[PDB]
């Protein structure tokens, strides 16, 4: 009924598919990819219809997740702050379709909704429990989670605790060792825990005031054996081992720590007024940060030193959200109006530092040390949003006009750490005034039902994302390698237009869905782009187009003659991106992907299973200038086509105990995902400092995942 493409996965579906990270969440979503395989920083984030990075609005309970951050080989943070084990559902929206979400959802939005006491407490009972134990063979990871919810008088409470402990996600390369000859995944030790607490008061009918507490800590100790013996030059060591045995990077060990703490208040109630029938608001405070610690034996020919690096990227967020719902009728049309405000107060800090100690004498090495440096002047970003949306029903038509006004103000704060960055480079030109942006983003959706089975829809939406502080103020000079990074204080915000139309058909014997989209991007921000020694500067791509077609379908085979419960389904996604400034393709566009399934479900749901077949085309349209091959050699690697088989099954051992099992990569095929390959080396610095054997970025071989869920 919604005039847009949105995919929802419930808590039960996540348990069925053994979803332990967002990479496994998008396994069978053909138009969404998650990268980061083989990278030190780990899982990067979502790629929706060729759009990834900070242009995807990732939020949990309305609170936006931190953006990416790259500041060299020892400073790289991704967007992996959410544990999928604490959500009741996840919604993937494509494009800035909704006015209720922020306009910075250029490529789409991924929304997480945490578990509520209602979905834990059984019907007819006042207390509930949920114990889960799971194992994943791909990363040798164990999961243990426990959730308890209760309902006493007019108060409801929920307490969730989960703990993960595992290792690195294995690749399908069969050679270990060190250097570029290592095709196995770098060893890792990953520990994670997540704490969720809710306490609500149901003081009236349709009214609830609640408290939310949330903590999440992820600790990964990595051994970058693939980087031993570096640096490398076009796939070969820069310094021959005959003269420097072991290279300049004798060994490199690291630790990445992710943290998210969130405290929130939410309130909704029913009102008898002419302005609204239902009002909800929430106030949240979130502290999310990433800590990268690097240790290495550094041997720059003349001296042996222990070189350490520390990087912290932190975001403190205050967000107030509101939404007032009013229902009324004007003549033959029924109206459903939703309006409100959204206030954001964001502080972003980034710090880099390092030390150097001589391994022969024990003395300090100032040449190998780094003082505390800030890449941006600790900005304070205030966002004010006003939105209104009306759902108008007239006969079989449904019109959804929308408006969202966004106001963004950024306040720089010059500190001594940032002044040091202005000293490292010879660029001391910084503007201490405030930068302001504002825009009205219209949105329109139309739905029409006909022939008792079909639905036509059209969607028009606009997106708006303001520049970040790193692009506006980041500066760095490398006289040794002959390049520098210039800030772009005149960078313009992104403007996008989304056009989408489609046809849906619902039957008792199955359903289908066809979608065609056309997205135009104006002033597409290309951070750290190489101009034309060398200059890296964030610039605006004036025009960019991404278009494609998505196909969905499901057939109930029992109606055509088959055992009841047997079904088949398919999902095919195609995209086409072009940079209209230079005519080059957009490398973030995934190849033609299709997922086909043959599944069975028992009549009472006691057991069932699904056989999945994923077919992906070979990548063809590649921009050679902006694509850096992971191995660094002259030849550029394009991912081939492949087909893989996966089998999921589920059995109810008891009325409370359910066993979910899944076998992946049945034929044990060595294959690559394009998003992992094209995203490994974003700027080209990794080709020399942390290269990847092409087999180390391959997907895991034959593996299984099993979990046991006890709903007491």
């Amino acid at each position: 009924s919604v005039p847009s493409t949105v995919s929802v996965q419930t808590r039960e579906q996540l348990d069925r598919q053994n979803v332990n990270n967002i990479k496994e969440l998008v396994r069978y979503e053909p138009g969404v990819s998650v990268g980061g395989a083989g990278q030190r920083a780990g899982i990067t984030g979502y790629n929706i219809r060729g759009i990834d990075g900070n242009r995807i609005l990732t939020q949990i309970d309305g609170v936006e997740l931190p953006n990416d951050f790259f500041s060299g080989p020892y400073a790289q943070t991704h967007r992996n702050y959410v544990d999928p084990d604490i959500v009741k559902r996840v919604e993937i929206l494509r494009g800035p379709a909704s006015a209720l979400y922020g306009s910075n959802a250029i490529g789409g939005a991924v929304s997480y909704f945490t578990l509520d006491p209602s979905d834990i407490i059984k019907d007819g009972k006042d207390v509930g429990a949920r114990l889960k134990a799971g194992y994943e063979s791909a990363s040798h990871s164990w999961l243990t989670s426990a959730t308890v919810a209760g309902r006493a008088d007019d108060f409801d409470g929920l307490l969730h605790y989960g703990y993960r402990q595992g290792h690195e996600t294995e690749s399908n390369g069969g050679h270990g060792g060190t250097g570029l000859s290592r095709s196995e995944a770098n060893p890792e030790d990953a520990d994670s825990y997540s704490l969720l607490g809710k306490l609500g008061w149901n003081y009236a009918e349709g009214s609830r005031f609640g408290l939310v507490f949330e903590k999440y800590k992820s600790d990964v100790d990595t051994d970058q054996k693939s980087a031993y013996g570096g640096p490398y030059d076009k796939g070969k060591p820069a310094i021959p081992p005959s003269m420097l045995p072991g290279g300049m990077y004798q060994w490199r060990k690291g630790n990445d720590t992710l943290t998210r703490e969130r405290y929130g208040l939410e309130h909704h109630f029913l009102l008898d007024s002419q302005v609204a029938d239902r009002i909800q608001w929430s106030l949240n405070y979130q502290l999310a940060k990433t800590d990268q610690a690097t240790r290495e034996f550094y041997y720059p020919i003349t001296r042996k030193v222990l070189r350490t690096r520390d990087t912290t990227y932190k975001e403190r967020l205050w967000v107030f959200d509101s939404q007032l719902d009013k229902s009324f009728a004007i003549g033959e049309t029924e109206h459903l109006l939703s309006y409100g405000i959204n206030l954001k107060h964001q502080k972003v800090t980034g710090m880099r530092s390092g030390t150097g100690t001589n391994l022969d004498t024990g003395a300090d090495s100032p040449r190998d040390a780094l003082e505390r440096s800030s890449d941006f002047p600790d900005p304070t970003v205030k966002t004010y949003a006003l939105f209104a949306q009306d759902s108008i029903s007239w006969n079989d038509w449904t019109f959804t006009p929308g408006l969202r006004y966004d106001y963004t103000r950024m306040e720089p704060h010059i500190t001594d750490e940032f002044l040091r960055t202005m000293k490292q480079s010879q660029n001391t030109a910084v503007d201490e005034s405030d930068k302001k942006w504002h825009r009205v983003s219209p949105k329109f959706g139309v739905t029409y039902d006909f022939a008792q089975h079909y639905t036509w829809y059209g969607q028009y939406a606009q997106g708006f994302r303001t520049p970040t502080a790193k692009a506006l103020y980041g500066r760095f000079e490398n006289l040794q390698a002959g390049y520098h990074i210039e800030p772009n204080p005149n960078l313009k915000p992104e403007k996008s237009q989304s056009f989408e139309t489609g046809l849906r058909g619902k039957f008792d014997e199955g359903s289908f869905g066809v979608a065609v989209f056309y997205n135009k991007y104006r002033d597409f921000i290309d951070e750290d782009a190489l101009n034309t020694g060398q200059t890296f500067q964030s610039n605006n791509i004036e025009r960019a187009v991404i278009k494609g077609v998505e196909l969905k379908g499901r057939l109930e085979l029992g109606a055509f003659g088959a055992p009841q419960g047997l079904y088949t389904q398919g999902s095919v996604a195609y995209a086409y991106g072009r940079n209209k400034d230079n005519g080059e393709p957009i490398n973030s566009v995934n190849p033609l992907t299709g997922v086909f399934g043959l599944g069975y479900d028992e009549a009472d749901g006691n057991y069932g299973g699904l056989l999945s077949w994923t077919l992906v085309k070979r990548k063809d349209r590649v921009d050679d200038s902006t694509f850096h091959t992971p191995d660094g050699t002259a030849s550029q690697f394009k991912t081939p086509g492949f087909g893989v088989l996966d089998l999921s099954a589920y059995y109810r051992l008891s009325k409370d105990l359910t066993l979910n099992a899944g076998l992946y990569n049945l034929t044990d095929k060595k294959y690559w995902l394009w998003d992992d390959v094209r995203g490994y080396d974003s700027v080209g610095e990794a080709s020399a400092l942390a290269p990847a054997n092409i087999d180390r970025l391959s997907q895991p071989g034959r593996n299984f995942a099993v979990n046991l869920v006890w709903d007491i």
Partner: antibody, heavy 127, light 107 residues
Framework: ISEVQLVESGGGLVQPGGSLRLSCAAS????????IHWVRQAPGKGLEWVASISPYYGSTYYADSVKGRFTISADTSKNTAYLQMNSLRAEDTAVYYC????????????????????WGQGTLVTV | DIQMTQSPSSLSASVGDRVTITCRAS??????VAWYQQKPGKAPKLLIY???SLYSGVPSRFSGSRSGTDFTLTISSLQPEDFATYYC?????????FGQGTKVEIK
């Protein structure tokens, strides 16, 4: 402790207007990622930078006083730098030094490497 | 293009004295200024690089400083082996420019 050893050769009495080739053999680490510089000192005068070669980028640089007449090249297989001097004048007589820059491609930018830390003994060219 | 004016051209100095050699640039330049010591009949030896950093093995008597377009080389306690000619060199990458040179003699 001693990364490279630089030795110059090819210097001597060339009659004015003639040609002469100077070679700079390096013993030790290869200077493919470094910069090799030629510096000459006329008798009783100061140091004057004349040319430079960066093998990694393939870039060559020259002073105005020697532009067009001098050619600088490198081998990177013999670890030897060459300075082809043509149309020599009486003002070109000096002691030509071969020097290697401290800064190189993979040096840490926080190390602040700058200048030439290794020099040859020099060869006398008399025009 | 850029010029480095080094003053003085000669310093009469006594063992134990503190001497200062100043090098002034003709334009706006970065900190890429190096200092060299040359004795007669010998190749130049690098002492200070990046206008402040002491090269490994060079005695701590030598020191570098910067003030705008003026660069300073200082010897806190002159010693008998420090009587030579000193040159300031400007530039991180080519082209490079050397100073006129300052000869330090015995007072």
């Amino acid at each position: 402790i001693s990364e490279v050893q630089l030795v110059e050769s090819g210097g001597g009495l060339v009659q004015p207007g003639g040609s002469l080739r100077l070679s700079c053999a390096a013993s030790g680490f290869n200077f493919y990622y470094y910069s090799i510089h030629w510096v000459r000192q006329a008798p009783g005068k100061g140091l004057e930078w004349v040319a430079s070669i960066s093998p990694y980028y393939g870039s060559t640089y020259y002073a105005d006083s020697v532009k067009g007449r001098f050619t600088i090249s490198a081998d990177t297989s013999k670890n030897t730098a060459y300075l082809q001097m043509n149309s020599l004048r009486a003002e070109d007589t000096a002691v030509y030094y071969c020097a290697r820059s401290m800064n190189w491609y993979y040096s840490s930018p926080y190390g602040m490497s700058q200048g030439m830390d290794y020099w040859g003994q020099g060869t006398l060219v008399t025009v | 293009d850029i010029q480095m004016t080094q003053s003085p051209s000669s310093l009469s100095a006594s063992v134990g004295d503190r001497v200062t050699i100043t090098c002034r640039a003709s334009q706006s330049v970065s900190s890429a200024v190096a200092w060299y010591q040359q004795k007669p009949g010998k190749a130049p030896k690098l002492l200070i690089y990046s206008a402040s950093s002491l090269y490994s093995g060079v005695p701590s008597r030598f020191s570098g400083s910067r003030s705008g377009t003026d660069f300073t080389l200082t010897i806190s306690s002159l010693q008998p082996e420090d009587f030579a000619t000193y040159y300031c060199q400007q530039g991180s990458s080519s082209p490079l420019t050397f100073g006129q040179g300052t000869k330090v003699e015995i007072k």
